[PDB]
Ligand binder design. Structure first.
Ligand SMILES: CN(C)C(=O)CNc1ccccc1
Length: 164
């Protein structure tokens, strides 16, 4: 089984009327839920407006994220993968001088919709510096990318991190 932390979705912005049961009935549409909790005050039992769900597999997390926007009990909520900042841009290092835009696009477009690819060049000489930035239309692409142990693009093992 994949590590549980990689199977969780933190759901912010809940309606205070959402319950463990209604959150579960909603998110079970995209996979088997091994856990589903609405966070509540320990004294009043009033909802804290957020909670979490745990799927059986990472593929199911992907399916839930691909089904956004989620309207749960009448309110659009904000699911995010667990920490294991929320940004839309990555740094890609170690691509050397022969990696081109299409190598980066063909690979990273499978994580999400790309808005910008910036291959970095030397301000003085114009030579490629061996790193790039990729901006996506949404943060979940970045979140999937940075939890991978490895990234291989154009035969190179790359270092990938969130950018600003
Ligand atoms: C045969 N296997 C293991 C797969 O197809 C998994 N694929 C997968 C896709 C997205 C997220 C996590 C996993």
């Amino acid at each position: 089984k994949e590590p549980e932390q990689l199977r969780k979705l933190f759901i912010g912005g809940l309606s205070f009327e959402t319950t463990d049961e209604s959150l579960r009935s909603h998110f079970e549409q995209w996979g088997t839920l091994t856990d589903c909790v609405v966070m509540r005050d320990p004294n009043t039992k009033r909802s804290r407006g957020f909670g979490f769900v745990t799927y059986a597999t990472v593929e199911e997390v992907d399916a839930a994220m691909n089904a956004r926007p989620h309207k749960v009990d009448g309110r659009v909520v904000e699911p995010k993968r667990a920490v294991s900042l929320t940004v839309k841009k990555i740094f890609v290092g170690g691509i050397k001088e022969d990696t081109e835009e299409h190598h980066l696009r063909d690979y990273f477009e499978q994580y999400g919709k790309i808005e910008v690819i910036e291959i970095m060049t030397d301000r003085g000489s114009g030579k490629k510096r061996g790193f790039a930035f990729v901006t996506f239309d949404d943060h979940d692409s970045v979140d999937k990318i940075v939890i991978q142990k490895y990234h291989t693009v154009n035969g190179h093992n790359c270092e990938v991190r969130k950018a600003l």
